[PDB]
């Protein structure tokens, strides 16, 4: 594979504690369980990741697979990031939402990378890597979004890279069955705490 995705996957895997590497790998499912059994998880981390990277090289891994891995990693390590809330008002199936969001971003910006993954409670996790009309995207400064289709609420992570927030909000508002969006008075590092109060307000207005 390209030398730029090998480094991405290696750096991503070196961040994962040995106490839970196997669970993440199993969820990713890119490597078969037989290949996992082939590996030794007791020698130092560098050799383990060398072996896993060789396995990925035998197959053909694309930036989509690595993006899926990064999404899965953040599902477990939510607290690493600060999470902000957005609200949508004045208002499609999941596939239409996916296509509209992706096409909006691809029209505004020539070079991007988008990915989705489903989750319980009708949730969808989104990862966006921002680019420009001249330059490639940055895979190490992404933007993560958690949107619950049966609700007008959307939660966002604080990137060290602005200049794309209004476009993101517009894409969320258009791809879904809404036409406006605002920011709520809630922000913290604990996504579940925001979630609980937000749906408490949603169910009990």
């Amino acid at each position: 594979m390209d030398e730029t995705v090998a480094e991405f996957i290696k750096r991503t895997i070196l961040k994962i504690p040995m106490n839970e590497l196997t669970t993440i790998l199993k969820a990713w499912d890119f490597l078969s369980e037989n290949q996992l059994q082939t590996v030794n998880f007791r020698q130092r981390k560098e050799s383990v990741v060398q072996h896993l990277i060789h396995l990925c090289e035998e197959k053909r891994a694309s930036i989509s697979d690595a993006a899926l891995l990064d999404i899965i990693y953040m599902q477990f390590h939510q607290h690493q990031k600060v999470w902000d809330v957005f609200q949508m008002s004045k208002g499609f199936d999941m596939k239409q939402f996916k296509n509209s969001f992706k096409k909006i971003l691809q029209r505004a910006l020539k070079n991007v990378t988008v990915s989705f993954r489903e989750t319980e409670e009708n949730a969808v996790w989104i990862r966006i890597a921002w680019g420009t009309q001249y330059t490639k995207p940055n895979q190490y400064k992404p933007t993560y979004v958690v949107y619950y289709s049966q609700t007008p609420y959307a939660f966002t992570s604080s990137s060290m890279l602005r200049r794309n927030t209004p476009l993101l909000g517009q894409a969320l508002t258009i791809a879904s069955k809404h036409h406006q969006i605002v920011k709520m008075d809630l922000r913290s590092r604990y996504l579940d705490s925001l979630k609980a109060i937000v749906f408490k307000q949603y169910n009990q207005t």
Binding site: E3, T4, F8, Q139, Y140
Partner: protein, 89 residues
């Protein structure tokens, strides 16, 4: 006059290349060796690199203008920069 500008620029010590262009170039070069990763750069590292580069270029220009005069000229040619690098090693 060239004579006033030479005298003024030899009394001075400040850097002559602007910062942001040099920073952009040095970050563009770095990303090729890091395999796509955008490394961070301390502020005191870019100044070091700039000082070194400007010194290198000034001394090279001196050595080359030594070779323009050897040939009976007043005007600096690339012909003269190439040969100085060969002789220096």
């Amino acid at each position: 006059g060239w004579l006033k500008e030479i005298r003024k620029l030899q009394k001075s010590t400040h850097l002559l290349i602007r910062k942001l262009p040099f920073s952009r170039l040095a970050r563009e070069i770095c990303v090729k060796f890091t395999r796509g990763v955008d490394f961070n750069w301390q502020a005191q590292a870019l100044l070091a690199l700039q000082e070194a580069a400007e010194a290198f270029l000034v001394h090279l220009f001196e050595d080359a203008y030594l070779l323009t005069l050897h040939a009976g000229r007043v005007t600096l040619f690339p012909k003269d920069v190439q040969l100085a690098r060969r002789i220096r090693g």
